[PDB]
Design a protein around this motif. Structure first.
Motif, PDB file in Angstrom:
ATOM      1  N   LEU A  24      54.319  -4.038 -75.870  1.00  0.00           N
ATOM      2  CA  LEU A  24      54.119  -4.768 -74.621  1.00  0.00           C
ATOM      3  C   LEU A  24      54.021  -6.273 -74.850  1.00  0.00           C
ATOM      4  O   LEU A  24      54.450  -7.052 -73.991  1.00  0.00           O
ATOM      5  CB  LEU A  24      52.869  -4.235 -73.913  1.00  0.00           C
ATOM      6  CG  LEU A  24      52.388  -4.755 -72.553  1.00  0.00           C
ATOM      7  CD1 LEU A  24      51.435  -3.740 -71.949  1.00  0.00           C
ATOM      8  CD2 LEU A  24      51.681  -6.100 -72.649  1.00  0.00           C
ATOM      9  N   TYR A  30      57.815  -6.645 -66.530  1.00  0.00           N
ATOM     10  CA  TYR A  30      57.223  -6.875 -65.218  1.00  0.00           C
ATOM     11  C   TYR A  30      55.938  -6.071 -65.098  1.00  0.00           C
ATOM     12  O   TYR A  30      55.978  -4.837 -65.060  1.00  0.00           O
ATOM     13  CB  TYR A  30      58.193  -6.486 -64.095  1.00  0.00           C
ATOM     14  CG  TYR A  30      59.008  -7.632 -63.540  1.00  0.00           C
ATOM     15  CD1 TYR A  30      59.837  -8.386 -64.361  1.00  0.00           C
ATOM     16  CD2 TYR A  30      58.959  -7.951 -62.190  1.00  0.00           C
ATOM     17  CE1 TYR A  30      60.584  -9.432 -63.852  1.00  0.00           C
ATOM     18  CE2 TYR A  30      59.699  -8.996 -61.674  1.00  0.00           C
ATOM     19  CZ  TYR A  30      60.510  -9.732 -62.508  1.00  0.00           C
ATOM     20  OH  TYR A  30      61.251 -10.771 -61.994  1.00  0.00           O
ATOM     21  N   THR A  31      54.806  -6.765 -65.040  1.00  0.00           N
ATOM     22  CA  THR A  31      53.535  -6.091 -64.817  1.00  0.00           C
ATOM     23  C   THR A  31      53.412  -5.665 -63.359  1.00  0.00           C
ATOM     24  O   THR A  31      54.046  -6.240 -62.470  1.00  0.00           O
ATOM     25  CB  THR A  31      52.367  -6.995 -65.212  1.00  0.00           C
ATOM     26  OG1 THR A  31      51.134  -6.275 -65.085  1.00  0.00           O
ATOM     27  CG2 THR A  31      52.329  -8.240 -64.351  1.00  0.00           C
ATOM     28  N   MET A  32      52.601  -4.633 -63.118  1.00  0.00           N
ATOM     29  CA  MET A  32      52.527  -4.045 -61.785  1.00  0.00           C
ATOM     30  C   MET A  32      51.903  -5.009 -60.780  1.00  0.00           C
ATOM     31  O   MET A  32      52.457  -5.240 -59.699  1.00  0.00           O
ATOM     32  CB  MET A  32      51.756  -2.724 -61.836  1.00  0.00           C
ATOM     33  CG  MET A  32      50.404  -2.791 -62.527  1.00  0.00           C
ATOM     34  SD  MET A  32      49.889  -1.198 -63.195  1.00  0.00           S
ATOM     35  CE  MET A  32      51.258  -0.829 -64.287  1.00  0.00           C
ATOM     36  N   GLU A  33      50.748  -5.586 -61.116  1.00  0.00           N
ATOM     37  CA  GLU A  33      50.058  -6.447 -60.162  1.00  0.00           C
ATOM     38  C   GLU A  33      50.716  -7.819 -60.066  1.00  0.00           C
ATOM     39  O   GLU A  33      50.812  -8.391 -58.974  1.00  0.00           O
ATOM     40  CB  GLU A  33      48.578  -6.568 -60.539  1.00  0.00           C
ATOM     41  CG  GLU A  33      48.306  -7.126 -61.928  1.00  0.00           C
ATOM     42  CD  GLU A  33      48.177  -8.635 -61.938  1.00  0.00           C
ATOM     43  OE1 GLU A  33      47.902  -9.215 -60.867  1.00  0.00           O
ATOM     44  OE2 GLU A  33      48.352  -9.241 -63.015  1.00  0.00           O
ATOM     45  N   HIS A  37      55.923 -10.853 -67.572  1.00  0.00           N
ATOM     46  CA  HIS A  37      55.301 -11.051 -68.870  1.00  0.00           C
ATOM     47  C   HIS A  37      55.919 -12.246 -69.586  1.00  0.00           C
ATOM     48  O   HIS A  37      56.959 -12.778 -69.190  1.00  0.00           O
ATOM     49  CB  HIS A  37      55.463  -9.815 -69.755  1.00  0.00           C
ATOM     50  CG  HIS A  37      54.820  -8.579 -69.213  1.00  0.00           C
ATOM     51  ND1 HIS A  37      55.100  -7.324 -69.707  1.00  0.00           N
ATOM     52  CD2 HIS A  37      53.905  -8.404 -68.232  1.00  0.00           C
ATOM     53  CE1 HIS A  37      54.387  -6.426 -69.049  1.00  0.00           C
ATOM     54  NE2 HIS A  37      53.654  -7.056 -68.150  1.00  0.00           N
TER      55      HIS A  37
END
Ligand SMILES: CCCCCCCCCCCCCCCCCC(=O)OC[C@H](C)OC(=O)CCCCCCCCCCCCCCCCC
Lengths: 55, 54
Positions: A24, A30-33, A37
């Motif tokens: 990661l 693409y982070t959820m919230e 990145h």
């Protein structure tokens, strides 16, 4: 006295967490919230470029 | 033949041979003991007061 042969570890270990986190930490994504990145060593370079307050 | 039996010849030669073998064996035992795992405490899992497992 023959060199002991310890029993191997169980199924669940720390390697999965470390490997997932290391994957990661780079390769963008693409982070959820949030939106996006940034690879490690790129964010660190950005931190030096913009700098931090002193004193 | 005066004071010894016939097999004394073989007994004396075998005694010399066995004495040499015993000297070699003693040297070997001394060396092995001083190079043993029990003497130097190798491959012996020393028990700890709190039983910590690396
Ligand atoms: C004289 C020729 C050398 C004979 C051995 C002298 C030293 C032996 C000794 O000090 O043993 C001490 C050892 C820590 O104590 C021990 O490890 C125990 C000794 C086990 C037997 C070793 C000797 C066997 C016979 C040796 C003949 C040569």
């Amino acid at each position: 006295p023959f060199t002991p042969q310890p029993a191997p570890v169980t199924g669940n270990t720390y390697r999965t967490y470390v490997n997932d986190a290391r994957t990661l930490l780079n390769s963008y994504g693409y982070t959820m919230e949030g939106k996006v990145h940034i690879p490690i060593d790129r964010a660190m370079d950005l931190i030096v470029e913009r700098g931090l307050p002193v004193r | 033949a005066q004071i010894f039996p016939r097999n004394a010849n073989l007994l004396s030669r075998l005694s010399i041979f066995a004495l040499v073998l015993l000297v070699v064996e003693g040297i070997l035992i001394l060396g092995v003991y001083f190079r043993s795992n029990y003497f130097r405490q190798v491959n012996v899992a020393i028990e700890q007061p709190v039983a910590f497992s690396h």
